[PDB]
Design a protein around this ligand. Structure first.
Ligand SMILES: [Cl-]
Ligand SMILES: [Cl-]
Ligand SMILES: [Kr]
Length: 162
């Protein structure tokens, strides 16, 4: 298991524009296209991201490409954020993947806001962090996925994913 396979399980793969859990237009492996209610706008952002007239549909390879770029960007976002980097550098490999997953889902900003959890993770107070992390909109809106990431931080193993 690794970050890619982990996110591929949590996000799935769809080759046609779809709406995510929040109703936003997305494609591929969780690649958000736009928060706008306009499908044309979505189609527009898609063609711009792929570089061709896709008509709302992409291939597997193109989806994989976007995903790679999105994972890369997520890590880079973490390393560039002053609230995040320190946590990330303090963690072991498995838990780092958990933090990247959260960022990929909710953005750097969103994650940087879990101040209290962040501190518990940094202190290696696993059970405590897990409990504070569950007290969130994130957990109540996508509880199965959230439980998987939370168990990951709690245990430091990939058991939630096997
Ligand atoms: Cl893009
Ligand atoms: Cl879920
Ligand atoms: Kr967090």
């Amino acid at each position: 298991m690794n970050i890619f396979e982990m996110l591929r399980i949590d996000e799935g793969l769809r080759l046609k524009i779809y709406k995510d859990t929040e109703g936003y237009y997305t494609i591929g492996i969780g690649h958000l296209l736009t928060k706008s209610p306009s499908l044309n706008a979505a189609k527009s952002e898609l063609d711009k991201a792929i570089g061709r007239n896709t008509n709302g549909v992409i291939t597997k390879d193109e989806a994989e490409k976007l995903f790679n770029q999105d994972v890369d960007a997520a890590v880079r976002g973490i390393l560039r954020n002053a609230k995040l980097k320190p946590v990330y550098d303090s963690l072991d490999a498995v838990r780092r993947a958990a933090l990247i997953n959260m960022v990929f889902q909710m953005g750097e900003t969103g994650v940087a806001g879990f101040t209290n959890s962040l501190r518990m993770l940094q202190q290696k107070r696993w059970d405590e962090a897990a409990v504070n992390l569950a007290k969130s909109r994130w957990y109540n809106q996508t509880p199965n996925r959230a439980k998987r990431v939370i168990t990951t931080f709690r245990t430091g193993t990939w058991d939630a994913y096997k």
